Write a protein that binds this ligand. Structure first.
Ligand code: MG
Ligand code: MG
Ligand code: MG
Ligand code: MG
Ligand code: MG
Ligand code: MG
Ligand code: MG
Ligand code: MG
Ligand code: MG
Ligand code: MG
Ligand code: MG
Ligand code: MG
Ligand code: MG
Ligand code: MG
Ligand code: MG
Ligand code: MG
Ligand code: MG
Ligand code: MG
Ligand code: MG
Ligand code: MG
Ligand code: MG
Ligand code: MG
Ligand code: MG
Ligand code: MG
Ligand code: MG
Ligand code: MG
Ligand code: MG
Ligand code: MG
Ligand code: MG
Ligand code: MG
Ligand code: MG
Ligand code: MG
Ligand code: MG
Ligand code: MG
Ligand code: MG
Ligand code: MG
Ligand code: MG
Ligand code: MG
Ligand code: MG
Ligand code: MG
Ligand code: MG
Ligand code: MG
Ligand code: MG
Ligand code: MG
Ligand code: MG
Ligand code: MG
Ligand code: MG
Ligand code: MG
Ligand code: MG
Ligand code: MG
Ligand code: MG
Ligand code: MG
Ligand code: MG
Ligand code: MG
Ligand code: MG
Ligand code: MG
Ligand code: MG
Ligand code: MG
Ligand code: MG
Ligand code: MG
Ligand code: MG
Ligand code: MG
Ligand code: MG
Ligand code: MG
Ligand code: MG
Ligand code: MG
Ligand code: ZN
Lengths: 140, 37, 204, 16, 174
RNA sequence: CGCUGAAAGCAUCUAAGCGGGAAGCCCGCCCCAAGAUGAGGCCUCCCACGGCAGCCGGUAAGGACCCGGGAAGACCA
RNA sequence: CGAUGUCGGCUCGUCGCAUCCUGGGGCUGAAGAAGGUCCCAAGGGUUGGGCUGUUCGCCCAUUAAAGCGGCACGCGAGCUG
């Protein structure tokens, strides 16, 4: 007998409210949902995890003094092109990237890895445009 | 202001405070003001 | 933020108060507006100006259809001016009076494949004292094993010119509205007969 | 800046 | 030996009303909103308000005294009000009102205008006395320090702007 | 450098909070830039073609080729 | 050691900051001007000559200043020699 591998399944849609949630402790469960490791028929070689819509990513919460001390970082390739950006300003200017970055580094590297990052759809503010899918609201 | 690694009182009117993660020493005689560093 | 399209025509010096002022002359007007960018429609705010009338033969259907939504005759060049919403539906040289200061944007004279001396003002090598076939050469371009590579944006020979250049805060010396001319003190990018953009300056 | 002069290790590449 | 527990006498008749994280203090001179840590408890008694701590550790002993003087200074604000005086010294220096602003002549190449912010009133009796008048205690000492900053007390002479009662310690010149 | 201020009846720029403060940091200026595969937006143009998410053909709006050239340019563009 | 070309110059730089100048500062045995001292700050800038192969240094005339250092004592499939 050989281990069941599934006929490719249709995904599930999922809405999460990021308000008041700690950054890393939402990022972990979101990354699990993306990987489909909440599924009894999980198959490591295919993308079967759900789609995850995140709302109120601006009101994501954070412990310690991170708001001023967490530094997201970028290298442009030129001499001097290391840019430091504190979490404070990241939230004021691109508040969806906070959750998107955190969630990223907890997703495998590689094609399937960077293919799942596109099945996460983080939004600031309380609404999202993915009404057509009618995502089951998940509590985490 | 004196910056050093040994901030001590110098006179009896000297005061040892710790503001913003650093030990200062403030006093009415300005030559006594000290930050640690 | 007023702006107008025009061609650069040539340079001269007029005289003004016992002082000779170098000028370059720009055939500015007139520029019919053919589309308006609004925050509802397009997110930002800008006016699409046209310039130089064009032989209706040489204008395809889609382009010709664009003009018809606005009732503008086929024109040669279309260009936007950002954060400009003029009252009329024709921008002319009248929006500039003398004393004002302008920014002029134009495609510079292309110098083609430029060596490291003409392009980046390098010094090259000696012309005697032993110099060996490196007279117009750049020299070192790196270090050694560390980093063992060349920095991005390392200034080298290559193409130079025929790029956009905005020269700023030029005094508007005169305006000849009958001729759609526009005097401008100093130098303006581009060759004679090249299309420039004249805008209200951003200085103080 | 090294104060003691550093002796060379190679002779000048001499035509064979 | 304890500021946090000393009750706050409420004059007649200023209202103190309690809310989460804030207490409002209406009064004949205005109103002021005082923010109160939800760890401290503000209780309205007969013509007296009182503050209590929910424990006996460092942060609760600290929030106690602070929130007390905060409500205390809020009550003196909407009843008596607050005021500081500044004493211009030095031969050239003087000051005058201009409608509502304050024009200081303290020896620059220019006078210095100061625009009073909301809730602050400028008064000039003598031309060497300026009076910062306001209901908000912290806002008053602010503005006064701002004005004194414009020409702080020199260290070698008796000229500048001096706080009412500020001593005049100088050092020798030669 | 301060304001207001406890723990610590005083004091303290701080433990709650708020000011002020560098050619430096972030925006601003100029230039590149949707291969930004996350490949965006707007205006406009053609449109149900014939035969067994496919295929083979004829077309539409357009485009390319070739030619005269150009302060564009090594060829290409 | 079946080769990792070696000083100095030229050229092209880039980085660090134990900061020469410019900016912001506290103490001063700070009257003022001008200094000393320490703190923050690496954005930009940091001249031309005489001497010696010289780096270094001394000197001339200036300057806001004439910083010190890493990059195989940066850089010979770039040049010099
Ligand atoms: Mg998987
Ligand atoms: Mg935080
Ligand atoms: Mg792996
Ligand atoms: Mg000692
Ligand atoms: Mg004291
Ligand atoms: Mg152009
Ligand atoms: Mg040149
Ligand atoms: Mg050049
Ligand atoms: Mg040049
Ligand atoms: Mg030379
Ligand atoms: Mg030469
Ligand atoms: Mg030779
Ligand atoms: Mg030879
Ligand atoms: Mg050669
Ligand atoms: Mg030769
Ligand atoms: Mg080499
Ligand atoms: Mg490397
Ligand atoms: Mg070009
Ligand atoms: Mg000028
Ligand atoms: Mg000509
Ligand atoms: Mg033309
Ligand atoms: Mg040496
Ligand atoms: Mg041989
Ligand atoms: Mg008190
Ligand atoms: Mg005077
Ligand atoms: Mg105090
Ligand atoms: Mg605080
Ligand atoms: Mg002040
Ligand atoms: Mg500020
Ligand atoms: Mg400047
Ligand atoms: Mg562009
Ligand atoms: Mg595209
Ligand atoms: Mg584009
Ligand atoms: Mg990317
Ligand atoms: Mg893809
Ligand atoms: Mg597109
Ligand atoms: Mg858009
Ligand atoms: Mg050209
Ligand atoms: Mg060609
Ligand atoms: Mg050609
Ligand atoms: Mg060897
Ligand atoms: Mg051997
Ligand atoms: Mg070998
Ligand atoms: Mg060999
Ligand atoms: Mg070899
Ligand atoms: Mg020499
Ligand atoms: Mg300095
Ligand atoms: Mg200074
Ligand atoms: Mg000093
Ligand atoms: Mg002095
Ligand atoms: Mg003196
Ligand atoms: Mg330092
Ligand atoms: Mg610097
Ligand atoms: Mg000689
Ligand atoms: Mg010798
Ligand atoms: Mg020597
Ligand atoms: Mg000097
Ligand atoms: Mg100086
Ligand atoms: Mg010199
Ligand atoms: Mg160097
Ligand atoms: Mg070397
Ligand atoms: Mg060689
Ligand atoms: Mg050499
Ligand atoms: Mg080599
Ligand atoms: Mg020889
Ligand atoms: Mg020899
Ligand atoms: Zn003392």
């Amino acid at each position: 007998m050989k281990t069941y591998v599934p006929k490719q399944v249709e995904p599930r849609w999922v809405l999460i409210d990021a308000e008041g949630k700690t950054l890393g402790r939402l990022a972990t469960k979101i990354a699990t949902l993306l990987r489909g490791k909440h599924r009894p028929d999980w198959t490591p070689n295919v993308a079967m995890g759900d789609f995850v819509v995140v709302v109120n990513a601006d009101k994501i919460r954070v412990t310690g003094k991170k708001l001023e001390q967490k530094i997201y970082t970028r290298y442009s390739g030129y001499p001097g092109g290391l840019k430091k950006i504190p979490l404070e300003k990241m939230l004021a200017t691109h508040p969806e990237r906070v959750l998107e970055h955190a969630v990223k580094g907890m997703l495998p590297k590689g094609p399937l890895g960077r293919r799942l990052f596109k099945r996460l759809k983080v939004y600031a503010g309380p609404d999202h445009p993915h009404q057509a899918q009618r995502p089951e609201k998940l509590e985490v | 202001m004196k910056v050093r690694a040994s901030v001590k009182r110098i006179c009896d009117k000297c005061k040892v405070i710790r503001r913003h993660g650093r030990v200062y020493v403030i006093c009415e005689n300005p030559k006594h003001k000290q930050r640690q560093g | 933020m007023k702006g107008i399209l025009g061609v650069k025509v040539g340079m001269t010096r007029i005289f003004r108060d016992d002082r000779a002022v170098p000028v370059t002359v720009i055939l500015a007007g007139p520029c019919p507006v053919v589309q308006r960018r609004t925050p509802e429609k397009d997110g930002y705010t800008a006016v699409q100006l046209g310039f130089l009338p064009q032989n209706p033969k040489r204008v395809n259907r889609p382009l010709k259809g664009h003009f018809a939504k606005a009732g503008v005759e086929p024109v040669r060049i279309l260009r936007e001016i950002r954060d400009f919403n003029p009252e009329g539906d024709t921008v002319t040289v009248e929006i500039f009076k003398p004393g004002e200061r302008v920014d002029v944007t134009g495609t510079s004279k292309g110098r083609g494949f430029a060596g490291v001396m003409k392009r980046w003002n390098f010094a090259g090598g000696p012309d005697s004292h032993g110099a060996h076939k490196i007279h117009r050469h750049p020299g070192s371009i790196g270090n050694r094993k560390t980093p063992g590579r060349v920095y991005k944006g390392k200034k080298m020979a290559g193409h130079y010119g025929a790029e956009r250049v905005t020269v700023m805060n030029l005094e508007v010396v005169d305006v000849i509205p009958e001729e759609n001319l526009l005097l401008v003190k100093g130098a303006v990018p581009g060759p004679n007969g090249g299309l420039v953009i004249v805008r209200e300056t951003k200085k103080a | 800046r090294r104060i003691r002069p550093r002796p060379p290790r190679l002779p000048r590449p001499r035509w064979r | 030996s304890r500021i946090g527990r000393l009750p706050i006498p409420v004059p007649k008749g200023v209202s103190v009303e309690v809310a989460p994280g804030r207490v409002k203090v209406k009064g004949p001179k205005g109103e002021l909103e005082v923010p109160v840590s939800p760890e401290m408890r503000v209780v309205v008694e007969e013509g007296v308000v009182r503050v209590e701590r929910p424990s006996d550790e460092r942060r609760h002993k600290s929030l106690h005294g602070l929130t007390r003087t905060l409500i205390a200074n809020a009550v003196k604000g909407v009843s008596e009000g607050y005021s500081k005086e500044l004493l211009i010294k030095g031969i050239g220096y003087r000051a005058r009102l201009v409608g509502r602003a304050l024009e200081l002549t303290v020896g620059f190449s220019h006078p210095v205008v100061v625009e009073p912010p909301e809730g602050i009133t400028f008064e000039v009796p003598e031309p060497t006395r300026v009076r910062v008048s306001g209901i908000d205690k912290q806002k008053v000492g602010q503005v006064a320090a701002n004005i004194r900053a414009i020409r702080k007390p020199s260290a070698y002479h008796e000229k500048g702007i001096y706080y009412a009662g500020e001593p005049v310690r100088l050092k020798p010149g030669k």
